[PDB]
Amino acid sequence: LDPVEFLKGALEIPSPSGKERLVAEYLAEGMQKLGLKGFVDEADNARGQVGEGPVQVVLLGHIDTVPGQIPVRLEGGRLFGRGAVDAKGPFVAMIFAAAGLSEEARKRLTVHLVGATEEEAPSSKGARFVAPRLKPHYAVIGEPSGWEGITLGYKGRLLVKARREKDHFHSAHHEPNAAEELISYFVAIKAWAEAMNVGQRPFDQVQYTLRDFRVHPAELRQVAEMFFDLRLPPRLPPEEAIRHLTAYAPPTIELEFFGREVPYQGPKDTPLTRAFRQAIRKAGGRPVFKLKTGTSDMNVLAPHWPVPMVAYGPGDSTLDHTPYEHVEVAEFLKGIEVLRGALEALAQT
Amino acid sequence: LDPVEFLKGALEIPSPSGKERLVAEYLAEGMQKLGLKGFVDEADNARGQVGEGPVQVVLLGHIDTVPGQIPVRLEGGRLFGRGAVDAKGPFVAMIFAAAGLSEEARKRLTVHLVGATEEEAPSSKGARFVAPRLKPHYAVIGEPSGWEGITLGYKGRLLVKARREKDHEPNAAEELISYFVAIKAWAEAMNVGQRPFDQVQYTLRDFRVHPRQVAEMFFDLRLPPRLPPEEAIRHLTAYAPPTIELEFFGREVPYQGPKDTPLTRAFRQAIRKAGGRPVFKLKTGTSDMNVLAPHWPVPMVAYGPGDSTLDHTPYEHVEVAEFLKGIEVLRGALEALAQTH
Amino acid sequence: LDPVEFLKGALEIPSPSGKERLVAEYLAEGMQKLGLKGFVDEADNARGQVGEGPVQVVLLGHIDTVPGQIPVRLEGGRLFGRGAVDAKGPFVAMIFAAAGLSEEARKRLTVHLVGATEEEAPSSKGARFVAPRLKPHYAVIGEPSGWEGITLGYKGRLLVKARREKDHEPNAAEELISYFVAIKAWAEAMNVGQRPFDQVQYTLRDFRVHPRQVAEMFFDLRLPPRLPPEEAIRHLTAYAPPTIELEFFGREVPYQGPKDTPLTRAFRQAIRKAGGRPVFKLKTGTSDMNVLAPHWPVPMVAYGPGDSTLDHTPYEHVEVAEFLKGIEVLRGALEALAQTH
Amino acid sequence: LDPVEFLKGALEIPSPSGKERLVAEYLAEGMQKLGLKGFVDEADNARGQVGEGPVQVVLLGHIDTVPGQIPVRLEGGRLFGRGAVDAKGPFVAMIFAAAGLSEEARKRLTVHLVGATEEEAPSSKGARFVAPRLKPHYAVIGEPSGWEGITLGYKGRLLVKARREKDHFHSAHHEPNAAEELISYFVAIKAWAEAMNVGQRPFDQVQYTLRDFRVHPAELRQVAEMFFDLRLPPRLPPEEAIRHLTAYAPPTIELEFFGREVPYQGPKDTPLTRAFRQAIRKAGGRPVFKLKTGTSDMNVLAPHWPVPMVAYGPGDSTLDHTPYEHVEVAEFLKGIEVLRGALEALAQT
């Protein structure tokens, strides 16, 4: 069973959020064959396990991707595919790493593998299913950090739907219509963020994105709806961010919040962090700590698992969600090498 | 034929822009019966004609409405329905006023009746159909002035489609918002110290986002005399970088006619005789008056019973008493200017 | 002593906050002469006292003004000057009303007169000096209500200094602007649908830029009952990142007293007897009523002749007739509540 | 006469705008000694000349600096001083370059040197004095481009003073006061620029800077004043930019415009451009074309001299106006070398 050919076959199985079963089965097979006792759980996660040691470590990735396949090709040193980077590659690298684990290490560690479902959706159903069922001492989240990167944190998230409906009236009267009231709210949110962001590094900025806007063709009534989202710095968790957005909203506007995720930023010096620092050096690289603008199951899991936790994976995260998503094979391989080393170093304490 | 019941039956026939034929039919029927030689023209306008005299008077209204039907009912002295005020009401008032003209006036005037199609749309197809097919000495536009009101002017108009196309920092939609916010701030600065007729009005009609990335906005400007379409277009294209593509359509010139005119004097007398106090008005929407001024270089006002603040609202209605006063005023004004000739 | 000429002489003495001594002197003099045992206290307040009765009534006004002297003149029935309305006028009206009290009332009431210092400043030093030195059963605050007007309430207040300090993309000044623009947008959203008394008012008082780079702003908020100082402070500090430093001072609680009270009833009678129609008012500024409510848990209103829209303007004046009606109303109200006791 | 010691002595003579005479005299001396016939003109420019050829080339720098000396020290390979980079170094490099010119080149070229006054002020008096007096075939503007850089353009400029005065009134009334009306104008300008800048590279963006804001302590009247400036892309020259700012200003606001400068962006392939491309290669570097966000006498002179023109100078322009302004000596020297080569290559056609 070869790392890159196993990944390729993973990439070839489409797995938009909610439709992960086929790939879970595949990942579970490969894990069965590698001695990781693979299976597919009640949430359709790809599950595995190796080792019998008392130190519980969870290697948790996600096996869903954003919708829309890209044809898979190995060409040059680059493997192309939806999920190459985000994040079938990272999770497959977890699988092979765990598969090549020392007897010494299978003595100190019990390593649980979770290919989580619906990480790309608001639910994170998969990570949430597993949260009350595992009690790790350490957790590694499979998201692309680059093979030399150790990511220490990810921003939180808030999804907002805003709505205005009112009686229709002539477009020449000075009173704003429903769409305009929504725009004006959004503009107020921009102003709020600009003030909130003064002097702040990107990890500490409130960021917003207008995702959708719809206006009903008006007849008796005007209806407009707006979907936006925020990426949340540590200083502004979701419940605080809701109080702010609510205070900036006039009473004419209906708000619905969802996809609440808390930010997470872990300390620079833990057993886990040293373990990866050492493994990247062994593998011949220069480790760099990273903080990421995105949101991951690290945010989802932090409230449940009060333990040292980082995110690691080969590949370049700026290829998330693009039509030419790919990883360098040599990077993917260094990725496996780093995961194994990190586990071994963990076991050597 | 009863004025109010005839209007009611007009309201009961949906005539959203482009689908005016059924109601034109009904209006033409009614005009036949009244001795107004009713018919439907090629542009599906309701047409009628009375009189033989040398001086041509056009009473031009419109018979399309914006969409959304209001259940038609008579209740508490008010007739409710889409078009009650804008502008089936005013046109029906024109029909009945014409129908009761003295034989004295029918020899001084020839009076043409046009229930125009597509006035609520960018085309104004209706009014543009008859523009070169009639040669008025005077013209009255049927839009709600209030029964004691005579409307001297309507703002011009410009419609705009803005488009932005990108690749998946801020996205196409957000960039269109920045444009919209700048044009708003521009309009506020241009408007400081101006009365409503002299203000620029800038409205977002629609905003469409398509998950490359692409977004469009449609805007609707109403234009004061100091800022006609080609001027407004120069500002807007100047504030748009080449990356935001603008399309212009629906251009109409503002119009504001003089306070003292034979038409104007006729209506003030007609109004006083009907027991009211006449009041000049400038309207902040746009009308077929704007479409027609460039073709008919003649005295022109807009008149009709009803309160224009109900235009396009879901409780559109006219007061019955006021509607009847509309009929009376029209007839007397028509009468007064037969006397001046 | 003539009321208007006495007021005039008061206006003619500058009393910007902190420099009230000369005019307190003059007011104390005048109160001596009137048999009101005039003096100047340690906080430089103008003080006076009349009556012997068990029920203490405080007529408290202020004698400082904002800076900028207006040439004092009597002209067209109007007395012009800094303080004419805010609030030398109301206090002088209180002096003369007290000076003409019946001997019947002088046995029911003891009436204290305070021309407070520094009411225009954050300190309100004056009113805070007397707060624990008097024990009123009722209190009247001398601020322009209009002669037919009785003021039930004034908004609270919060002052803010914002500072930003950097190294020479956007500069410190611009970043302070972003904060200001956000707090404005916050206030507009909080105010939608609220009457003025229930609105938050957010004013830029000063903006200082010093070419590291450093800039400061000073803001002045007026606060509705639903948003007192400590609440307003929680919003503002929440919307400020740590990089923008906020200082709070000048906090005053909003106050809005009940419509039906012996004080309130007294003034409505006094007003009717003076030939006017009494009207409750809520004022959008801040006053010593706000400073004093927390100390004097007793019925309280503000009253004085003059139109408060002239506060702080360069044409500040009171109409002479209205000023005299102020005297009359005050006296009658004082009289009416001696009768209820 | 040594390049770096001559520069050092230039840096030691303070020359804030308007007070350049002392340094002009010094620069003129050195030019006299080097055979460039130095003198100080009616505008206090440092003037020189070398060569008798029919091809007129002007090497024009500026000898004024922003106010505020920094103590001069040669330490490490770095020479510290107000003007090291902007722009006494560049002009001194012009002087020594011209001084070491071939006989072959003094035959084809007449090279005019101008150490212009008041370039850092709105006037640009010095460049404007010289504009009607020289008819170059080529012009090189002495501003720091880096020793490997050839700058092809600089943005234009507009200075704006805005004022509002009105009758004073109570701070609790909803009507905005004078300072607030000015802020609101500025905010409108921000919105205008944000829309103008959609999709635009920095050289093509309208940029603004609030320079000062004053509010009179109000007594009978409110007075507020605001000073800001714009850096102007090629698509928006100063007269167009005035129409825009004026349209966004309500009639209550008084505007005064000044320091109008037109943007300039020259073509990539001219005799001058090839001449510098070749000289940087000879000197062992990789030439890069640059467009700059700042404004220079290149903008001032372009309308007068319809000829190929670039900006060149050793040093890093991000040290303009900072308290530790300096140039690497070795860079300064490469700078001279490049200027000479460029002149020689010009003469060799």
Ligand SMILES: N[C@@H](CCCC[NH3+])C(=O)O
């Ligand atoms: N009267 C309608 C339509 C104007 C366009 C004329 N074809 C309006 O104000 O929107």
Ligand SMILES: N[C@@H](CCCC[NH3+])C(=O)O
């Ligand atoms: N009445 C003044 C001052 C209020 C502060 C009381 N010490 C104002 O509205 O600004």
